[PDB]
UniProtKB/Swiss-Prot annotation:
The keyword Mitochondrion does not apply. The lineage of its organism: Bacteria, Bacillati, Bacillota, Bacilli, Bacillales. It comes from Bacillus subtilis (strain 168). It comes from the Bacteria. Keywords: Signal. The gene is ydhK. The chain holds residues 59 to 205 of 205 of the full protein. Residues 1-24 are annotated as: Disordered. This is Uncharacterized protein YdhK. The keyword tRNA-binding does not apply.
Length: 147
């Protein structure tokens, strides 16, 4: 149950720029090489969106309480409240507009690191359950491998 909950959002943010020359085209098949959450490492995935933006590592306390989410990959420029286009810096405090999971939307987040890269939204087949996780947000270009 907790697998789909950690990839529980389905709305694409406004003003998000689709990638001009992504390494992995939309509709292409990739392998996820990162361990953000259980069931993703080495999973079969399909690219459903590719965008040129700034990806941030963030730390925040969920709005519903419980343990602090430490160094979470990723929230993007377009998911930070009132951010506009100015790049956020390490240590900056912000309000998250992202709702990837329960307690994230409206949380006070600290910016841990930032990077301009291509970020991908992907469908993937969980390696632990075998269930199709839809439009998971997000994985950067360097966390994907060509199928």
């Amino acid at each position: 149950h907790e697998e789909m909950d950690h990839s529980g959002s389905a709305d694409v943010p406004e003003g998000l720029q689709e990638s001009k020359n992504p390494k992995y085209k939309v509709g292409s098949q990739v392998i996820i090489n990162t361990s953000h959450m259980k069931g993703m490492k080495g999973a079969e995935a399909t690219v459903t969106g590719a965008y040129d933006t700034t990806a941030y590592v963030v730390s925040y306390t969920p709005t519903n309480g419980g343990q602090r989410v430490d160094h979470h990959k990723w929230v993007i420029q377009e998911e930070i409240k009132d951010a506009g286009d100015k790049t956020l810096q390490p240590g900056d405090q912000v309000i998250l507009e992202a709702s990837h999971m329960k307690g994230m939307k409206g949380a006070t987040a600290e910016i841990d690191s930032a990077e301009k890269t291509t970020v991908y939204m992907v469908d993937y087949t969980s390696t632990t359950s075998g269930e199709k996780v839809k439009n998971h947000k997000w994985v950067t270009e360097d966390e994907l491998s060509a199928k």
